[PDB]
Nucleic acid binder design. Structure first.
Ligand SMILES: [Mg+2]
Ligand SMILES: [Mg+2]
Ligand SMILES: [Mg+2]
Ligand SMILES: [Mg+2]
Ligand SMILES: [Mg+2]
Ligand SMILES: [Mg+2]
Ligand SMILES: [Mg+2]
Ligand SMILES: [Mg+2]
Ligand SMILES: [Mg+2]
Ligand SMILES: [Mg+2]
Ligand SMILES: [Mg+2]
Ligand SMILES: [Mg+2]
Ligand SMILES: [Mg+2]
Ligand SMILES: [Mg+2]
Ligand SMILES: [Mg+2]
Ligand SMILES: [Mg+2]
Ligand SMILES: [Mg+2]
Ligand SMILES: [Mg+2]
Ligand SMILES: [Mg+2]
Ligand SMILES: [Mg+2]
Ligand SMILES: [Mg+2]
Ligand SMILES: [Mg+2]
Ligand SMILES: [Mg+2]
Ligand SMILES: [Mg+2]
Ligand SMILES: [Mg+2]
Ligand SMILES: [Mg+2]
Ligand SMILES: [Mg+2]
Ligand SMILES: [Mg+2]
Ligand SMILES: [Mg+2]
Ligand SMILES: [Mg+2]
Ligand SMILES: [Mg+2]
Ligand SMILES: [Mg+2]
Ligand SMILES: [Mg+2]
Ligand SMILES: [Mg+2]
Ligand SMILES: [Mg+2]
Ligand SMILES: [Mg+2]
Ligand SMILES: [Mg+2]
Ligand SMILES: [Mg+2]
Ligand SMILES: [Mg+2]
Ligand SMILES: [Mg+2]
Ligand SMILES: [Mg+2]
Ligand SMILES: [Mg+2]
Ligand SMILES: [Mg+2]
Ligand SMILES: [Mg+2]
Lengths: 138, 128, 150
RNA sequence: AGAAGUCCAUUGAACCUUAUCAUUUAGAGGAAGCAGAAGUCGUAACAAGGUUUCCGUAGGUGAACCUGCGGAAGGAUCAUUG
RNA sequence: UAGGAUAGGGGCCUACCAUGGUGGUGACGGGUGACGGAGAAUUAGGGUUCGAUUCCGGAGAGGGAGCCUGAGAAACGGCUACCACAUCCAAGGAAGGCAGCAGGCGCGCAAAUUACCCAAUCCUGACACGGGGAGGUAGUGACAAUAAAUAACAAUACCGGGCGCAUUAGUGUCUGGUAAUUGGAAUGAGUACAAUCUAAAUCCCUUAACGAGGAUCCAUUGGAGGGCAAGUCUGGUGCCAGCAGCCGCGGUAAUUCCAGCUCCAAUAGCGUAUAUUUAAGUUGUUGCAGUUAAAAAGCUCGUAGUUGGACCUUGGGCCGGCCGGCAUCGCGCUCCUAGCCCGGCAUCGUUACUUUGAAGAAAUUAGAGUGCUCAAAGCAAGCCAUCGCUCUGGAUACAUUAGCAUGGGAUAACAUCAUAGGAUUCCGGUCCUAUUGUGUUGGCCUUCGGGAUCGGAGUAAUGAUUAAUAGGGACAGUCGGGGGCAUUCGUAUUUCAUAGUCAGAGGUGAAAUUCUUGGAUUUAUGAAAGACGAACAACUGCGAAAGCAUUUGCCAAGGAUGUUUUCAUUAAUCAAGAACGAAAGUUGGGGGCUCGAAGACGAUCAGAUACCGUCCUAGUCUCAACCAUAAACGAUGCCGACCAGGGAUCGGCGGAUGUUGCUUAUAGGACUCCGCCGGCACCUUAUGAGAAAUCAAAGUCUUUGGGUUCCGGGGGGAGUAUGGUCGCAAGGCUGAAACUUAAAGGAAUUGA
């Protein structure tokens, strides 16, 4: 059972200190490996498109998910970013600047796309939203 | 392995919950008697007797059938006249009835007499 | 329960309500004092002395007859042992066990029991140093322990 | 009164040699784990799963696995006075 | 210790000397994408996270270092030197420091004008006057925050429901409306004379004149399967393209994609990414769990740590209207306060706790007052005859911990009356200081005061709580397959011997390998060897667990019972540390019956590196030394209390008449009945608990708090990598991360 002594404050406080490391969220935020990730603790990052690849969807689905492999400017890492909309892959060209964000779920893959946790949100300084909705052109 | 005023109060809850009319507390002390006086003066038990064969002691209590739960706060916290309110919200069923027992340099007494006499102390238990 | 087992027996003595000596006990405090000192000088510790006075001379308890515990009687007359009684007997048992152990080195049950008895000796010696019934320098040698007793 | 220069001290940047730490970076070769997909070989487990299953240890084999020793029931027996 | 230096204390530094100082209450080291605080976000309460930034404190001016001037600097809008970088050159030389304001490059997801002014607030100089990129003003500015447009009203109308006839109608009620229907009234968005604003301008507030028919003065962002509010509408596409936080949608009839219409939510705003709080009682002090879902160490000992039984008056009264002031059987006062002989006095145990007070920066928070037109704000303002000015305000509170002071003395700590070295109304003695009798100064000392030593008469109620259904120790008769050493025995198995017999024996579902007329298997007597200890033998015993079963002897140990013996709190649980720890395994001797990993064969089979059969090596046994693990299981740590009924059973004890193939009679042993302690368990039952299975402890839990140790936080990766440590080795202990994944899992139900 729990220690209950009046003079037990050290035991309780040190015990909580030790046991908090068993919690995945605490350990994820207090261990430092987020600075080793592609974005290095950033919401967005700019990159240069290296190639367009295209990835299959997992078993219950069947489709080709069209993604662009990007190189991050700040650190030179290489990632794959989904291009969200119908026909927006044709806006992407080779060696153009692109603004990438997370997919949601904070670094964990979304939906049926295997091993992709990044999404393309801007190309050539112009939104994919404005290009898909014809508000602006590049 | 003993720290009395827990065995006494828990023996009383068990006996009252079975509907017994007499309960017997083997090890007694002045603290237990002082607590039982508050119980009686607020009306939750009938009269009780000390049986001294010689030793620590022994008492028998007469149960009136109106007590619902009486327990101890072991790890007796330090309790000033301003945080009485928050203990009684954490520990009593309502603002209308129930008592927290505090030991104070002015004796053992319930929290309401403590408010009137403006003294804090250390919490011993509660009953309601 | 027991300090060094799982036994939970409650067998022990129960003194009566009545503090005063019984009606039929006619012996005077000085004669009982004399019996206690006589048995003590013969080498009997307070437990054996109490057993004697219970059994032969019809003394239920000395503290009821004379008003003073038998150890206090032995102390006032300068006859209490130097090593308290329970520690004396623990030391003697530890010596007996160790003597048995050098003759049976693969008897691991007695090795376990020797550890238990030395543990009890150390705990009682801690008590005795704390309460000034032993020198604050008394310490227990496995080697030179038979010289002290028997 | 007194400048240049100079002598010994003192604070001491900076550079060098070895050692050492700490952090990032290459590698012949090896060996893992994962995910995926209509490949191959068997049938290990779930029924007494067709040799009850499993735990520790030790050896052996394409693979699952097999065997010896001791243990458990989470067993397929809460049961012999019949 | 003595110096030197400094404005000054100080190993600050020098000489000499001593050997210390910090550390499981975490030193030293490492990380910090770490300046500290006031504070910020979220907050039922408790908490969690943040704090570069305008206030306070510190630090730096490319990196170090050294300085001059000066009251003040180790200054950088000062100097000197070096390192890094870099500029002008007439090639000898010269000058550098934007983490000031604006601006530029670079870095980036990420941040404004190379503007005006000292007019406000203040600083500064010789100074009322100069100066101020401090500071203000304007500009850019959907960072956040406040208020608040995009329409109101009328009758018409195809109509649409209640309410008037409610019959049978029909329309008329608040108008609910597709109505680009008809009709005027209203207004500020915009524009702009003017005044006002301002340092000069500008914006706002006033304002002349303009300025509204609904196509415009035109509202967006996200959605419409579920969660979650809103379409089983219409085209397209056909597991494609695509959507989808999650579950999922899409494979020719898509409520989910691409679009239209329509509807939904918020609305001048809304979506997305990342971080963080809430949800999260999924970090649990309040407040979670650990039989089976993740999770009690194999077991016991043990130091620190945490926890700790009962006991020593404020009890019996007066007193005035919750408390003062007394009195009972209240250890004293010279000195401070000191009533008209009189309360309420100070040092001859400390703390925690609690009460009250002081001293605590502002801003922020809470909060009193006040109509900036409301609000976010701000600290103002309100009245006068809104006439030679009146009344003013600019509160108050919170502030954990530490420090200061005050009352209380229950609760709990730590220190402590058995060596009386105790207190004590009094007596002088070893000895010194010296006052008012020295109007002066003092100066050894007579009654006198004080330490303090001090031999004794003094008085007194003369001074040690009890003996825990806490613990230890002693004693008594016992009990046990508890341990160790020696010793006794048993049949069986294998081998051999001796004798008899002749064809098979073995093994299997069936066979084969194997043995066999040098007689196998069988029978009989005996010997040797090594292992094992059947039956009795159990919902039985003993042990800390692992474990322990032939006899007898010896050695020490142990629980329970009994007790009018003893000590007196000595105790519970436990980091460090330590003993023991099945089997297998390792090294070396001994042994070597049986069985038997490996191996060799025989079968079976599609194969059979297996199951089955035969022969067997290590091993199994023993000694010395290692190893330290098991489903080491009751998958349930230990100590304590309470809580239900019953019958058995083992140990001990007590009480019963009634019988023994017992016993000079009895007692006792065997049996029967009753009771009390202590064990191993079992049966029935909820008034209980639980997800249930189940459990009389897994109960006494949202009505949550007896004490303590270990340990869990979705599934994997993984008991893996790495470092340390132990081991001869096998391995043991300690023990991650990347990555991956939407379930894995427990109990029970219905089916198959
Ligand atoms: Mg989590
Ligand atoms: Mg007990
Ligand atoms: Mg113990
Ligand atoms: Mg297959
Ligand atoms: Mg197949
Ligand atoms: Mg198998
Ligand atoms: Mg199978
Ligand atoms: Mg099988
Ligand atoms: Mg099975
Ligand atoms: Mg094999
Ligand atoms: Mg000095
Ligand atoms: Mg920093
Ligand atoms: Mg920074
Ligand atoms: Mg500052
Ligand atoms: Mg400076
Ligand atoms: Mg710079
Ligand atoms: Mg400088
Ligand atoms: Mg500058
Ligand atoms: Mg600048
Ligand atoms: Mg829309
Ligand atoms: Mg949509
Ligand atoms: Mg929805
Ligand atoms: Mg709905
Ligand atoms: Mg989304
Ligand atoms: Mg799914
Ligand atoms: Mg949807
Ligand atoms: Mg749609
Ligand atoms: Mg949980
Ligand atoms: Mg399991
Ligand atoms: Mg489990
Ligand atoms: Mg301890
Ligand atoms: Mg006792
Ligand atoms: Mg023959
Ligand atoms: Mg038996
Ligand atoms: Mg036998
Ligand atoms: Mg084989
Ligand atoms: Mg284990
Ligand atoms: Mg376990
Ligand atoms: Mg266990
Ligand atoms: Mg019996
Ligand atoms: Mg019993
Ligand atoms: Mg979790
Ligand atoms: Mg986990
Ligand atoms: Mg199941």
């Amino acid at each position: 059972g729990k220690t209950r002594g009046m003079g037990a404050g050290r035991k309780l406080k040190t015990h909580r200190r030790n046991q908090r490391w068993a919690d995945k969220a605490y350990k994820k935020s207090h261990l430092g490996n987020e600075w080793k990730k592609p974005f290095a603790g950033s919401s967005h990052a700019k990159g240069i498109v290296l190639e367009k690849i295209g990835i299959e969807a997992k078993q219950p689905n069947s489709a080709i998910r069209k993604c662009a492999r990007v190189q991050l400017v700040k650190n030179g890492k290489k990632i794959a970013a989904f291009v969200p909309n119908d026909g927006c892959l044709n806006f992407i060209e080779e060696n153009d600047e692109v603004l990438i964000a997370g997919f949601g779920r904070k670094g964990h893959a979304v939906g049926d796309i295997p091993g992709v946790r990044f999404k393309v949100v801007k190309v050539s300084g112009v939104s994919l939203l404005a290009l898909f909705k014809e508000k602006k052109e590049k | 392995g003993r720290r009395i005023l827990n065995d006494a109060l828990r023996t009383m809850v068990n006996a009252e919950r079975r509907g017994k009319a007499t309960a017997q507390l083997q090890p007694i002390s002045g603290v237990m008697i002082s607590f039982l006086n508050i119980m009686k003066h607020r009306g939750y038990i009938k009269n009780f007797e000390v049986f001294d064969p010689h030793r620590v002691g022994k008492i028998t209590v007469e149960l009136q059938g109106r007590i619902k739960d009486c327990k101890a706060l072991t790890y007796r916290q330090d309790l000033r006249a301003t945080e009485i309110e928050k203990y009684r919200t954490r520990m009593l069923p309502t603002r209308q009835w129930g008592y927290v027992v505090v030991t104070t340099p002015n004796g053992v007494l319930d929290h309401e007499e403590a408010i009137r006499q403006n003294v804090g102390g250390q919490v011993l238990g509660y009953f309601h | 329960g027991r300090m060094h087992s799982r036994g939970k027996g409650i067998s022990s003595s129960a003194l009566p309500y009545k503090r005063t000596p019984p009606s039929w006990v006619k012996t005077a405090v000085a004669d009982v004092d004399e019996l206690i000192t006589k048995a003590a000088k013969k080498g009997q510790m307070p437990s054996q002395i109490g057993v004697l006075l219970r059994d032969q001379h019809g003394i239920p308890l000395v503290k009821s007859v004379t008003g003073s515990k038998i150890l206090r009687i032995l102390k006032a007359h300068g006859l209490a042992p130097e090593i308290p009684e329970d520690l004396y007997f623990l030391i003697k048992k530890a010596v007996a066990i160790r003597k048995h152990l050098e003759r049976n080195r693969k008897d691991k049950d007695s090795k376990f029991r020797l550890i238990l008895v030395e543990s009890r000796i150390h705990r009682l010696a801690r008590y005795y140093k704390r309460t000034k019934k032993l020198p604050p320098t008394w310490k227990y040698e496995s080697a030179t322990a038979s010289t002290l007793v028997a």
